[PDB]
């Protein structure tokens, strides 16, 4: 029962006896580490309690495998879920600090990139909160993806520093090490078994990150792998000879696996590295899982119970090698026969798809994979032949020519010969998505429309064969992190007006706000909370962008990966149009025509994506002029927040008035940031695409700003443009010409506008229809202007967004996964 | 006041809440870490108490700088000095372990190599025990020198694994980081000051190893440097392009500084690396020292008080760069004028010499040093010119031709032009030893004869100039580690018969054993203690060498660096002679002629020293035959203990009956292992050389086995051999021929014997006089045989060795350094 007193003693204790700094003074960094270690003490108690119960009881356990987890900062959520925010705040008060200052010392854990990773993270919170026996498995990336800086020249990339001192959270398990093999050869023994000898041998060591549940003792693990080699592999002979690099070579090759996330793969070395990362994740994870299965089993070890005890979820095609690897282990190591192993495999593994287009599903060079994982490629070839025989059986050999088409689309190997075709240099590839739909008992999309697109467009034939496999699991975000903790002002309101705090768990109770949406008292509280959140942001923007902005203005935010298809370019074009129209007006007219706005951009551009970077540069330049133009004042500000991450999101989302989700219609599978915006009472402007659809439905069409073409239209409108029919709006041309004038920039921008012109060519002819949708967009923004002027209306919309968000709780998503795929049951930790 | 109960709770606490292993079970490795962390809690309390007092009081502080510290295991000495051996033993009992088993888990800290490093370590124990305000400074080497393995083929080297899990002792100071610069250029500012810009920039981070004193709270620091670079220096551009090595390049170049000790320097890269290691040590240390001086000074900062507050001891020529660097800092950074800086420097720095020969004193390429440390080379040139003017002043310019000789020998630069010689391609070098004798206020040898050799032979001219500089400080070893803890059986005896335990501190009380040396009760206790110690060794030899040996036999040990000049070859030749003579005898005769012996060799050979390795191979082969020859049985065993280190020494020395110190007379400056042997009642066979002289004196000539030629003789006996006069003894020829017969080996050994033959040539003509001394040696060993047969006599000798060892306490040595060089006074920590 930790109180302010015990926590104070705890923090002091750690500062002295588990130091990572000099004894003098109690600065912020020291205070953070000591605080974090105090928190971790509690986490470990419950982690052990959970671990023990799970071990003794031997229920079925689920394992979520992902190449990214976007964990963010742990501190406030850890104390939050533990219900010690008050005690820790008081203890820090006693030590001459405040909670918010200490929490800001913590770096975001750079273990992921985007929604894929954040989904996994939200899931871990839900899994723990709901008492579900499940773990995450990932790689412990040293330098993350990259830290973004915004210079005069725009985006620059620099390696992450999050481990420079180290993580106070993680728990290294020195006794939890597993061998990983690469390269080498396969050979048959006199016993008839396959033996994969030789190659490179490395180790994978476990680091546990405890994940505590909300108002429970259930604390699960995010177990991360770090790759290394023994000290003995250091070549003294080389080093003493002066060949210092050559000496370090083995450990360098081993460790780089865990250096950065999504390493550049234009190079052969890059591709090899990627494949190693995947294999490392799959193999280390599986070995650890199987070890745990073997333990718990005691004397009797019934392998046919494996799927009744183990579920493995593959977050995207990255953990695909789980299928071949689990086969390899069950056959070569455990001695099972093909059918037994294949049964167990399928009943264990499941797949989640996040992609709309069939291109963008992972493929590998056959030669490359076969060189690196020879034994795996054997097992893949086998699995593929079994499929070829099952196709021929089912469809028969009466129609032909179509059967050939059904093989060409469904086969796991691409440009391969076939065993015995009745029938009468293109490169050979392995299709990982196909492998996933074959080796797994379940395939799910992340939104209702998306899941339908999986069954109808991408995996049509497989859907025909095995309808029972296909599912949907609409995405979610945790209300702990994304309401309760990131937005205390609002949380207080919800607790008041729903009459309880139960909503953090029973989030459907948000719907009870509907009936009060027009109440003037609630409206005032609501407007005050939103204003409060914006203050925190104003200082943030000051210190990070250099620009002073006012509250009392619409916060219009677009925070996501910089890509042409996300159409940051559309938003900023809208901003520049509005700017031009200002300017060509008197002061009095400006105030009557446009409401005050702070337009906030955020997100990272792929370093080698020339256009993406150009766009970031454009935005910063637009801001440069607008923000210093004295005729604009505090009517319009444009800022680009550097280094968008979970922490930034936790700051901006609570303070957001409008959020932009304006990707070319279709394209997006789901999206999650929109769900968090909605939860915080943000109003969304976006296309009919991804989760926008389900959100718009649940919040109400009147409380969402829809614009632009739709999924059905796109193909036709591209077939416009080509043929040479498309006519641009005059206002769009006006923006382009205003840019070319030099208005914002010594900087060129000709190659930027270039992408929007023409009717053919790669990287040209406005593929993403910024021009086409530009009209409906700026028109829609005028409507936003109107709504914002009517604060009674605007606030009602805000309230209804929060009231209709409850189904996007990740608790709902995980209840679904738990019951309909993994088949696991809650477990109480008294 | 920690008791068994609190310590038990402490160990349990750490096992759970500061884990580095999985929760399951309480194996040895986990138990060790938990135990060590419990110990460290106490160490930190007292480390802080000491730190605080030293800070407030602002006395003079001494800093011992060394490229090696041979710290060994910390556990038993830490609890020993804390006086908690009993409580920790009981606590571990309660947890289902025993102390000795836990302690054996700890790896020796691989931070040094030999006596040089061990001297430093002993000093740190004394310094703390005696309450002297002083720290050590060193490098935190990752892989030490190398771990020795003994194979069928002899010695193999493999990198040390001591940090593979990490040290439970060290305390990282993340806020204690100092910039180190390499390369770059110097340039003068408009203010007239020198500016060293550009080059490579790296960081040096402090790791504290607490060193507790015996029966005191004084806990000082061994502060180790680890070199690194910020995360930002990681080149993402390179890495994502596939150039994974090139990306890692900056951090690789920075970190390799702290990889291994004494890296091979045949290569240019090796030499550069060495120089970086030295500079890193000097610069990081000095910066930290100066920082501490600046602090403590408060507002008033009087640089002329620097030497009254700071002493810097240079252990050998490795920390030579302290002189140039301290000048650089005081001039360029602190703005002092040449004379002020030079005054302060000299009054701060002092030098310790460990070498007999003038060759073997460090020299550097001028071009190389000037490229790496340009600003330093400037300051060296200045210091040298000042010397050239002081020489000319003092000796005048009347004699000439001799004055030219006095410049040639004393100048710091070699093959350099002179400023204005009155007077009327050899490579340019920097003489580091010369620099040390100029920049320091004190120069000391490590033994009385050695110190005289410094003044007379090596630094004759400097002695003429500055007699006042030269001193002696005869070496010592700590009685804590090397009696009290490594030998409990004996410790109990000493406490009994001296009537108190005070001797651990007041070690002169060992002399009181003299009067009881012939007492039959003491003799029995003594013989029992020695036998007891040998049991521990028998199991050790079983598990490490594979050979079963009996107690009841003379333990005849030679443990030290394998080198021709140490003459392991002599010892083993003696063993092979004795073996041959056996064999050519009946069983009954063998027992009458030779006493049972276990002959134990230990030590490491330089990897590229062809002969040294051949010797190790020889010894192992001799053992192979002898130990399996059924006609020899337990009359003779020859073992080579692998991986000789502090722990091995702590095991073998207490169990030793005879110890061999048989280097070619002269050559050795001191030696310390002999002092530890003597302390444990070992009888020494050795030449009149190094510390053998002072030991032999103090223990009594009758209780030492002297043999072989002497320092005066050697030159004459080399001038024999050359000229072609030397006649070999027939028994020596008999050994050589017995080897050539193939007796021991398929292995060749022709190139081994080769070194002993001829009268001229590098690597030939028995330079180290194994042949010449062979007669007196085997004769002397026959005397050993005789003495061993007379157990009353033998035991008396043993007792008198311990009784006459007390002056070789490192407490005596440090009292001397403290009063006569550093001028520091004890400080009480209540
Ligand atoms: O400088 C840009 C890139 O130039 C490429 O170099 C030339 C090629 O060598 C040359 O052969 C020819 O290209 C051919 C291709 O070989 C064909 O495959 C292509 O076929 C179809 C196809 O269905 C498809 O490409 C489609 O194009 C769409 C595309 O489907 C959309 O996704 C979108 O493209 C985005 C893309 O999604 C996004 O990732 C981003 O891509 C950047 C990447 O850094 C990189 O892929 C690319 O590389 C260079 C490289 O030098 C050569 O590959 O750079 C882009 C930066 O823009 O942005 C793009 C933006 O478009 O939109 C396209 C719209 O076309 O339709 C094509 C039919 O055209 O047919 C082309 C025929 O031109 O020309 C290349 C250009 O000189
Ligand atoms: O294979 C052994 C080494 O061979 C060397 O290669 C040949 C040379 O190229 C060639 O020029 C000639 O060598 C010359 C030298 O150039 C002269 O300097 C030398 O001068 C004097 C000098 O006063 C001194 O060397 C002295 O020799 C003593 C020496 O003082 C003692 O210390 C001792 O030497 C030990 C040594 O201390 C120890 O470290 C260990 O050394 C090994 C090292 O790995 C390495 O130095 C050496 O390298 C090779 C290398 O290929 C060439 O340098 O290998 C040795 C392994 O033995 O052991 C030695 C053991 O002796 O004892 C010597 C006894 O001579 O006296 C010489 C006068 O001779 O004069 C020689 C003339 O031969 O021949 C070299 C041999 O082919």
Residue numbers in the entry:
A (entry chain A), B (entry chain A): 23 to 446, 511 to 916
What does the paper say about this structure?
S. tuberosum phosphorylase is the first starch phosphorylase discovered3−5 and has served as a model SP for biochemical studies of plant phosphorylases. The most significant structural difference between the Pho1 and Pho2 forms is a 78-residue-long peptide insertion in the middle of Pho1, termed the L78 segment. The stPho1ΔL78 structure reveals that activation of the enzyme occurs through the proteolytic degradation of the L78 segment and the association of the two remaining protein segments to form the active enzyme.
In the crystal structure of the stPho1ΔL78-β-CD complex, one β-CD molecule was found in each one of the three molecules of stPho1ΔL78 crystallographic trimer with B factors around 170 Å2. The β-CD molecule binds at a totally different location from the glycogen storage binding site in rmGPb. The β-CD binding site (named glucan binding site thereafter) is situated on the surface of the protein molecule approximately 20 Å from the catalytic site. The stPho1 glucan binding site is at the entrance of a channel leading to the active site and β-CD is bound at the one edge of this channel encapsulating the side chain of Phe848 where the other part of β-CD packs against the side chain of Tyr853. There, the glucose residues of β-CD, G2, G3, and G4 are involved in five hydrogen bonds with the main chain atoms of Gly847, Phe848, and Gly849 and the side chain of Glu650. Hence, the strong inhibition displayed by β-CD for stPho1 could be attributed to this. In the HvPho1 structure, the binding of maltotetraose triggers a conformational change of a loop between Thr422 and Ala427 from an open to a more closed conformation, but such a conformational change is not observed in the stPho1ΔL78 structure upon binding of β-CD and the corresponding loop remains in the open conformation.
